[PDB]
């Protein structure tokens, strides 16, 4: 089997993307952020305290014929940017882009943070990280990915991102139509439970590559790209005006520059992301101070090649025996 699904990014600046799912039966469609940076697949629900719900779509187990409640599992999640949610867990019927699983344990929520009530466009979150990570107790879940993966053509899914314009997320296959040149391939840890990979280095706008080993995670659910201090004050430096800024928390610059590219090395292979992809608007509105999209990862503890670096490329996620990740131009 395969799937296919449309992701679209929720505000002018591309700050995440969503997908629709189809939960429960009849189907609940909501609109979930693809996460392969974490392995809970979880939604607004019936259950989620009210004054906590500002615009959601939410899902409703209890209209759904094939919802069963998971006697006794709950979850409870807190993620890099400090939002989170918990609840309780029913096992219902998933599908993506017309890839069916069933018996997904699909997390629902009874409390989220002010980050997510905030954020009326997304409904929940599907993770697709290892399900070494997943967070429900006692006992622990499996992914969307993880579940569908037996009965899918090949053992992948791809996310193919677009800059301010939707993109694609596909499982089962690999669409050779959706970039240029060939796909390569790299090694992958799966022993902090995510995709992690080793870049070979990196060059800024028309400069000369520099080879180092740069150890991140493919982040899907994160927005921006996060890398040592060394390399982003050596992007930033080429940008007139740009500064770090304590006040803002991170890298901002004159909304009047032209910003340089930004490559990054996977094995011998080049992926360019250009300037403008590494715009983020003015800090609030009306301000002529913007704000970077590649940031420092200092204090993260682990570099993130989050959705500017992944929308410059056609990435391939290999959940074969020994997982890999590719990576191509498109």
């Given at each position: 089997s395969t799937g296919s699904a449309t992701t679209t990014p929720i505000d002018s600046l591309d700050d995440a993307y969503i997908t629709p799912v189809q939960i429960g039966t009849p189907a609940q469609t909501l609109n979930l952020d693809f996460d392969t940076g974490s392995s809970d697949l979880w939604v607004f629900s019936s259950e989620t305290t009210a004054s906590e719900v500002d615009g959601q779509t939410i899902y409703t187990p209890?209209?759904?014929?094939?919802?069963?409640?998971?006697?006794?599992?709950?979850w409870s999640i807190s993620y890099g940017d400090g939002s989170s949610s918990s609840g309780d867990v029913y096992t219902d019927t998933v599908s993506v882009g017309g890839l069916t699983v069933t018996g997904q344990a699909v997390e629902s929520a009874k409390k989220v943070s002010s980050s997510f009530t905030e954020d009326s466009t997304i409904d929940g979150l599907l993770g697709l990280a290892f399900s070494t990570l997943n967070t429900v107790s006692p006992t622990q879940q499996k992914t969307f990915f993880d579940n569908a993966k037996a009965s899918l053509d090949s053992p992948v899914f791809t996310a193919d991102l677009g800059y301010h314009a939707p993109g694609t997320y596909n499982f089962g296959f690999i669409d050779t139509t959706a970039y240029t040149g060939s796909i390569t391939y790299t090694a992958v840890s799966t022993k902090q439970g995510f995709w992690e990979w080793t870049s070979t280095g990196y060059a800024v706008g028309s400069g000369t590559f520099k080879?180092?080993?740069?150890?991140?995670?493919?982040?899907?659910?994160?927005?921006?790209?996060?890398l040592p201090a060394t390399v982003v004050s050596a992007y930033w430096?080429?940008?007139?005006?740009?500064?770090?800024?304590?006040?803002?928390?991170?890298?901002?610059?004159?909304?009047?520059?032209?910003?340089?590219?930004?490559?990054?090395?996977?094995?011998?292979?080049?992926?360019?992301?250009?300037?403008?992809?590494?715009?983020?608007?003015?800090?609030?509105?009306?301000?002529s101070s913007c704000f970077g999209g590649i940031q420092s990862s200092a204090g993260i503890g682990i570099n993130i090649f989050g959705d500017v670096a992944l929308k410059a490329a056609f990435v391939v996620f290999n959940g074969a025996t020994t997982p890999t990740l590719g990576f191509a131009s498109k």
């Open positions: 209890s209209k759904s014929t094939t919802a069963k409640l998971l006697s006794g599992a709950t080879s180092t080993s740069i150890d991140g995670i493919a982040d899907t659910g994160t927005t921006l790209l996060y430096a080429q940008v007139s005006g740009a500064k770090s800024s304590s006040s803002v928390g991170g890298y901002v610059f004159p909304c009047s520059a032209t910003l340089p590219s930004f490559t990054f090395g996977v094995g011998s292979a080049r992926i360019v992301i250009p300037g403008d992809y590494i715009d983020f608007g003015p800090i609030s509105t009306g301000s």
